[PDB]
Swiss-Prot record, chains A, B, C:
Domain GS beta-grasp: residue ranges: 15-99
Recorded coiled-coil stretches: none
Subcellular location(s) of the protein: Cytoplasm
Main location: cytoplasm
Signal peptide: none
The protein, known as: Glutamine synthetase
Keywords: ATP-binding, Cytoplasm, Ligase, Magnesium, Metal-binding, Nucleotide-binding, Phosphoprotein, Virulence
Keyword Ligase belongs to the record: yes
GO molecular function, one term: glutamine synthetase activity
Broadest EC class assigned to this enzyme: ligase
Organism per entry: Mycobacterium bovis (strain ATCC BAA-935 / AF2122/97)
Subunit structure: Oligomer of 12 subunits arranged in the form of two hexagons.
Entry-annotated residues carrying O-AMP-tyrosine: Y405
Length: 477, 477, 477, 238
C-alpha cells in the first residue's frame, strides 16, 4: 500500500540482514519458503522477480506448467524475531514466467484480484478486515492412525483435567490452580498460568508492526488466548493473519510450548474462532453507517449482510474449510450457526458491534469463521458474498435481538442454520459459486481444485477411519 | 412354529434344568434378561405370562406406561451351554398387561406382525431368511474419550500388524505365521490360528439346534470368521441370529478371547457384513423361480428386488443402523453400495446366487446389511420393502453382470449408490417410511423413536468429538 | 478517594510501564482481566471508558445484554510486582454502554452504592473496614471426582502429619521441626519454616501501598499465616483485600508454593477466617465511642451490632458464602457461631476490641466472616445490616463476658447460634433480604442470581457426590 | 430373612474373590441401591387390602395405611433410610422415590400399587423409598406403625397421580410434597413426631432417643466436620 522497495532495502541495510526469506502461500493456507543471501536481494528482485519450480504436488503448477516467477510485496517485509541469522521475511505473488500473468491458484493473487474488483464495481475502493483468531497453548501433542487402533492426546501442565496428577510431567509437585471456576473465565495469576508467554507474544507482534490501540486486547482463559490488533485492507489483513499465526506459534515454540489454531482441540471446552469485522470505504469515507437504519446500518451494509447470510452455505467452504471446523460449529457454546444478524446474540452468524454514532466505527462482524484455512481465500470469499448482496440488493431476513436460546420452538424453526458438515458446504460451493467467479476473482478451476482437495485429502480420509467412540458404542453389538 | 409348550417342559425335565432365563430384545438389538427358578416355570407362564417393569430407559415403557407382560415363544427354547447352573433360555414377546396387546415397540412383535401381514396380502404365507454374519476374534480391546484425548485399540496375538513384535504379550516368543499373504485368504494351519476355537463355536451351534447341510461352511481368514447355517422363517431367523451372536461371543469369551460383530473394527482390513438371502413361499411351494426370467427370477422376485433397490436409502436405517456401518459401506473392498442386482458383481446391493434349475433354491441375496443392529427390525424392513415392490410392481433398473469396477466413467455414473452416512439414511427414513407402516407392521411411533435414538445416542455423540486424524491433519493449521 | 487520573499517568510514565491490566470483579469474588498496551492508556480511558463483551457465562451480561463499558478507579492503580513486562494494574466499574448506568451486578458498583447510601441516610459519611484474612501455605494440592472414587490431598514439607517421613518429597532427609507443640503456636525458627516467605509477602504488600503501623503484624503458625494492615473506606478496603490475596498467592507461587484462603483446608487444624473491624465516621469524627456505654460503645454502635446479630442468618450468605465455610463455623476451635457481642469471648460473632478511652480507636469486630467469597458484597452486606439496625434502633441481646464454653447448660441454651449449612443461610437470605435492597444498594435481581449460583454451582454439586467418610461409615451396612 | 439374605450375598461374593456393598449410593453417576417393601395386612387367613370398587383395587384399610405412610414419611425415613449415604440416592434424578404420593404408574412415587389384577390375595402396596443401609427389624416395624396409625385415624392420602410426574406443569408440580433430603432432617422430624411409634409400647421413647443420639454423634456430626473432596475443586482457589 505505502511501503517502497527502497524502504525495504533500507530496513535490510539498517538491520544488517544476512538472509531474505522468500514466502508464498499454498492452497490450504500454510506459508511456504526458501532462503536467499541478502547480497542477492536487489532491485532486480522487484523488477524481474525470482524463479522457482512447482514443488511438492497439489494445487500449484505441475509438470505441464512447472516453473513459476515470484514478485515481492514490499508491505509484507518484516524482520524475523526467531531466526538466529538476521533474516528479512517478504511475501510474494506467483506469476507465469512468460506472460508475467498472475497465477490464478495463488491465494495472494485472489485477494489482490478481489480488491481490484471492488474498485471496478464503483461500490467502494477499500474493504477493511479486522480478524480475531483465538488459539490454544499446549505442552504436548501426539497422535497416530493404525490398522488396529488410533489415538490423539493434547496436554498442558495446567490443564483442568490434570487436577488429580500426583506429580507433574517433569516429576515436580502439583501446585494446583488448574481448575476452571464458575463466575469468570479470565482470572488473574496464578490461575492464569500463561501471563509471561502471552506478553512475549504481544511484544513480538508489536515489534513486528502490529498496531494495538483502542479496543485491542491481550486476553487469556486457561490455555486459550487471543491478541487482537488493528484492521487492514483485505490483502494485507490476510498477510497480517499469517504473520500473527507465525509469531504466536514460534514464540510458544521458543518457550517450550506448542500452539494450535485448530477449531476444536478440546472436547468439552471452548472452540477457537476467527471473528471477522468488515466494512467498505470510498474516498476516505465510511459507507456502512446510517442513523436511520437498524443498528446504524446503511443500505450498502444491510445488502452486504444479505449476501453473507444468503451465501453462507457455500461461503463456509472457504471460511470454515476443515472437518474439525464442524466440531466448533455445532449446537452448544452459542456457536455462530444461526443465519441471522443481531446486536445482542453471539450465536448469530453476523453481529453488529455496538459502536454508537461514530460512522467510522460502524462495521459488521462475521462470527462463523475459524483460522483452520486460508485467510486470503476466506476474506476474498466474504467480500464477494457481500458484493453480490449489494449488486442484487439482497435483503437479509429480519434481525433478532431476543435471546435465540430461549425462543418458542415454533418461532425458532424459522431461524436457518449453517451446514453441519464439511462435505455439505463443499457440495453447496460446487452447486453455487457464481458470486465467487464475478470479475474473475475466483476461477472455476480454483474452485474445482479446492473441492477435490477437500474431498480427497480431508473428507474421505477421516470418513473411512473408524472413530474411537464407535468402539464404545458398537464393539458389543 | 412347531415346538409345543410340552416339548419345552420335557426338555427342562430331561436336562435337569435349575433356572430359566427370560429373554427379550431391546430397541437397538441387544437381548435383555432376568432369571427365575425352574420350579416357577409351568403352564401359567405360557397362559398368563410373566410380569416385569419398564426397566432401564429408552425405547420401551416409561413411567406413564411402566409395567409389561412377557409371553414365551416355545420355538426359541435352548439349553445354555455356558452357564454353570443348568439353564434354559427362552425368548418372549412383550404385551400390555391389561389388553394383552402386543407392545408396538418390541422388535419381536414387529417381526411377528411382518409375518402375519405377509399372509394377509395373499402374496405368500412364508418369508425365508438366511443370514451370514461375519465377525472378528480379538485378544483385547480398550478405548476411551476424554477432554484432551481419545483412543481405541483392538489386538490379536496373530494380527498381521504384529510381525515385528520382539515377544508376545505374555512374554513368550513370536513364532510368526501372522502375515496376510497374497493369493489366498483362507490358508490352513499354522497360518490359520483359530481352527480349534471356530470348531468349538461350530460344535456349540450344532448342539444348540443349528442346521448345517449343503453349502453351510465354517470359514476363517486371519481373525475374521463366519459359520453359516440353514435359513428359517423371518421371526425365527432373527431369533437364530441373536442366538448365533450369543454362542459366538461366549464361546470366544470362555476361551480367553473377545469377539466383535461391528462392521469395521480394522482400518485396512475386510469389514464384517450380514448377507441376507430371502425368498417367498406359498402352500409349500417356491415363488421366486421362473426359467424364462433373467437369472431364473419370477415376476414376484423381480418386483421384490425393485422394492429393495427403490427403498434402500431408507431401508439401510434398519439394515446398516450404526455410524460404523458406513466405514464398511464405502468405496473399496467391492462394498455392496451399488443399487443394482446381478449374478456376478459382489459390489451389487442384490446378488442372485447361481443355483441352477432347482426352483426351491432360487433366492435373492441382499448383501448390504451388517450385524450392528436389530435382526428383527432389519429382516422385517427388508420384507416390507420387497412387498411394497410386489404390490406396486416396481421394476428394478436393468441388471449388470459386467464388472462394475472397470466401467466407462460416463456409463458408471448411471449406477446409483447407497447413502454414505447414518445421518443420511435416518433422514431418508424420516422422509419416506410408508412402506414400513403398511398393515401396521411398523408404527410411526416406533420409527420416530428409532430416528431420535440414533440422532441423540449415536450420530450427535460421534459428531461432536474430534477424530484423531483431525490432529494429524489440522494441529499445524 | 484522593488519587487523580494524572497521578496514575505519572506513575505509568515514571515506572516505564509497558502494559495496563484491566481488572474487574466477577460475582463469586475472583478478579478478571485483559491487557492493553500502555500506549493505549490515556485520558479517553477515564472519560469514555473501555468496551468489552459479557464473556464467560454466569452473573454478568448474557447475549440479550452482551456489551459492557469499563470505567477506571484511579485509587486502585498499582504496579504489578510479579509480571515480567512492567505492568500497571487498575480496577474498573462495569457500566451500561448506552446509559453509562452502573451495572447492578458488578460487585464494585454495589460497594460504591453502599457508600453513597450511607451518606444519603445522614447517619455518617464514611464506613471504615479493617479485615484480617488468614491463609495456608502448601507445597502441593491435588484432587478429583470420578464415578467410582474421589480424593483430595494438600501437603507441605513441614506439615505436622509428616513427622514419620523417611525422606522428603525431593529425596532429601527429614530434618524434623514439623511437630506442633503444646504451649505456644507462634514458635521462632526453625519450628517456623516460612519466615523468609512471609517477609517477602510483607515486603511486596508494603511496596504495593499497604500501610502497616500500630497493631499491624506479620504472624505465622505452622503453614498458616496472616499479615494485617491499615483499614480503609468500604469500597477501597474491599479492593485492598483482593490486592492482598493477589500478592499473597503470587508471592507464594513465585517461590515454589501454593496458597489457599479456603476456610477449612485441614481437618484437625485451625480454619482461616476474616475478622472484619468496622466503624462509622462523620465530618472527620468517630461515631462509635461513648464513655457511658458498655465497652465504650455509643447508641449508634450498639444498634449497628443489633443489626449484625439480627441479620446474621442471612448476612452469612455473603459473609461465609461457601460450603467449606461451614467446616470452620462448627462447634470447636471457639468458632464465632454465638450470636452475641463481647469483649472477652472469641467465640462471639461480634467482639469489641479493648482499645481504652481513645474514641478514634473504638470499633466493632465481626469475627464470623471468611475470605471464601466476594469482599465487595460481604462488606456492603455488613454495612446494610448495621444501618438497618441503626434506623430501626435494634437492641442486641445482653453482651456476655463470662466464658461461653463453661456455661450452665440451661443458661447456654439462651445463646443463639449461626446457621450451620450454606443451604440454610441461602434459604434465610431468600426469605429476608429487604435490609439489603434499601436505597437500591442490592437488587432483588442480584440477590436471586446469588441464590441460584450457590444452589446450582455449589450446594447441589457437593450434595449429590458421596463423601469418602460415607464409605468408612456405610460400605458394610 | 433380609439379614440372612445380606449374609448369604456378602459371603458368597467373599468366597469367590469379590466384595459386596448394600450401601445406597456407592457410585456417583450410576443407579443407587434400594429396598422396595411390599406390605399387606391379613386376618383369619384372608386378605384385607383388596376392593374392586376402590382406586387400584384398594380397600379402605389399604388406603388409610398409605395415608399413614405418606403422612409419617418425614419421620419414618429415620428408620427406613437411616444413613447419610441414603440421601445420595434419595435426590432428584433416577426417578428417586421422593414424591409423597401413591400411584400405579410412577416409580418416583413413595408408594406404588403393583398391577396385580382381580386376585385379592395379590393386592399389596409397595413402599419404594427404603434402602438396606439400616435395621430391617426397626424399618419394617416403623412402616407397620405408620400404616396402623393411618388406619386408626382414618388418614386420607392426597389424590393418587398416574400422570408422569417428571413432565408436569411447574405450578401443578409444586403441589407434590417431597421427602426430606438430609438425614439430620428426618432425625429432627422423628424427634418432633414419634407418637405413632410408641403406640402399644412397640417403640419406647428411650429407644427413639438412643437412635437419634447414635445418628447425630456417630454419623451426622462425623461426616459434617470433615471437608468433602469436591470442596477443594470448588474452593481451594477462593
Ligand atoms: N472499517 C473498519 N473500521 C473500524 N474497525 C474495523 C473496520 N473493518 C474491520 N475492523 C476490526 O474490528 C476488530 C475487533 O473486534 P472486537 O473483538 O469487538 O474488539 C478489530 O480487529 C478491528 O480493527
Ligand atoms: N427360500 C430359500 N431357499 C433356500 N435357501 C434360502 C431361502 N431363503 C433364504 N436362504 C439362505 O441362503 C444362505 C446362504 O448363502 P451362501 O454364502 O451363498 O452359502 C443360507 O444361510 C440359506 O440357508
Ligand atoms: N474506624 C476505625 N478506626 C480504627 N481502626 C479500624 C476502624 N475500622 C476498622 N479498623 C481495622 O481493625 C483491624 C485490626 O485488628 P487486630 O487483629 O485486633 O490487630 C485493622 O485491620 C484496623 O486497621
Ligand atoms: Mn468478537
Ligand atoms: Mn454371501
Ligand atoms: Mn482479630
Ligand atoms: Mn420393585
Amino acid at each position: 500500500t505505502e511501503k517502497t522497495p527502497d524502504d525495504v532495502f533500507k530496513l535490510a541495510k539498517d538491520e544488517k540482514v544476512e538472509y531474505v526469506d522468500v514466502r508464498f502461500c499454498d492452497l490450504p493456507g500454510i506459508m511456504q519458503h526458501f532462503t536467499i543471501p541478502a547480497s542477492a536481494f536487489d532491485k532486480s528482485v522487484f523488477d524481474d522477480g525470482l524463479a522457482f519450480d512447482g514443488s511438492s504436488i497439489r494445487g500449484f503448477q505441475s509438470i505441464h506448467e512447472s516453473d513459476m516467477l515470484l514478485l515481492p510485496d514490499p508491505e509484507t517485509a518484516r524482520i524475523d524475531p526467531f531466526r538466529a541469522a538476521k533474516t528479512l521475511n517478504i511475501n510474494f505473488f506467483v506469476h507465469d514466467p512468460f506472460t508475467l500473468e498472475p497465477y490464478s491458484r495463488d491465494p495472494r493473487n485472489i485477494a489482490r484480484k478481489a480488491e481490484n474488483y471492488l474498485i471496478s464495481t464503483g461500490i467502494a475502493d477499500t474493504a477493511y478486515f479486522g480478524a480475531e483468531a483465538e488459539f490454544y497453548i499446549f505442552d504436548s501433542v501426539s497422535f497416530d492412525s493404525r490398522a488396529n487402533g488410533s489415538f490423539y492426546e493434547v496436554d498442558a501442565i495446567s490443564g483442568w483435567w490434570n487436577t488429580g496428577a500426583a506429580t507433574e510431567a517433569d516429576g515436580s509437585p502439583n501446585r494446583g490452580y488448574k481448575v476452571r471456576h464458575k463466575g469468570g473465565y479470565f482470572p488473574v495469576a496464578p490461575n492464569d498460568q500463561y501471563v509471561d508467554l502471552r506478553d512475549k507474544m504481544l511484544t513480538n507482534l508489536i515489534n513486528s508492526g502490529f498496531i494495538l490501540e483502542k479496543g485491542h486486547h491481550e486476553v487469556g482463559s486457561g490455555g486459550q488466548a487471543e491478541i487482537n490488533y488493528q484492521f487492514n485492507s483485505l490483502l494485507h489483513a490476510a498477510d497480517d493473519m499469517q504473520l500473527y499465526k507465525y509469531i504466536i506459534k514460534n514464540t510458544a515454540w521458543q518457550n517450550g510450548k506448542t500452539v494450535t489454531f485448530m477449531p476444536k482441540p478440546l472436547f468439552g471446552d471452548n472452540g477457537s474462532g476467527m471473528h471477522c469485522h468488515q466494512s467498505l470505504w470510498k474516498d476516505g469515507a465510511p459507507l456502512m453507517y446510517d442513523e436511520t437504519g437498524y443498528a446504524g446500518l446503511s443500505d450498502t451494509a444491510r445488502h452486504y449482510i444479505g449476501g453473507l447470510l444468503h451465501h453462507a452455505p457455500s461461503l463456509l467452504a472457504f471460511t470454515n474449510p476443515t472437518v474439525n471446523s464442524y466440531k466448533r460449529l455445532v449446537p452448544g457454546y452459542e456457536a455462530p450457526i444461526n443465519l441471522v444478524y443481531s446486536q445482542r446474540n453471539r450465536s448469530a452468524c453476523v453481529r453488529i458491534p455496538i459502536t454508537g454514532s461514530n460512522p467510522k466505527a460502524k462495521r459488521l462482524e462475521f462470527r462463523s469463521p475459524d483460522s483452520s484455512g486460508n485467510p486470503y481465500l476466506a476474506f476474498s470469499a466474504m467480500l464477494m458474498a457481500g458484493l453480490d448482496g449489494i449488486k442484487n440488493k439482497i435483503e437479509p431476513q429480519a434481525p433478532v435481538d431476543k435471546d435465540l436460546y430461549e425462543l418458542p420452538p415454533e418461532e425458532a424453526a424459522s431461524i436457518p442454520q449453517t451446514p453441519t458438515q464439511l462435505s455439505d458446504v463443499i457440495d453447496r460451493l460446487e452447486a453455487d459459486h457464481e458470486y465467487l467467479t464475478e470479475g474473475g476473482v475466483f476461477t472455476n478451476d480454483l474452485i474445482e481444485t479446492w473441492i477435490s482437495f477437500k474431498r480427497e485429502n480431508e473428507i474421505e480420509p477421516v470418513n473411512i477411519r473408524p472413530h474411537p467412540y464407535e468402539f464404545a458404542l458398537y464393539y458389543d453389538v
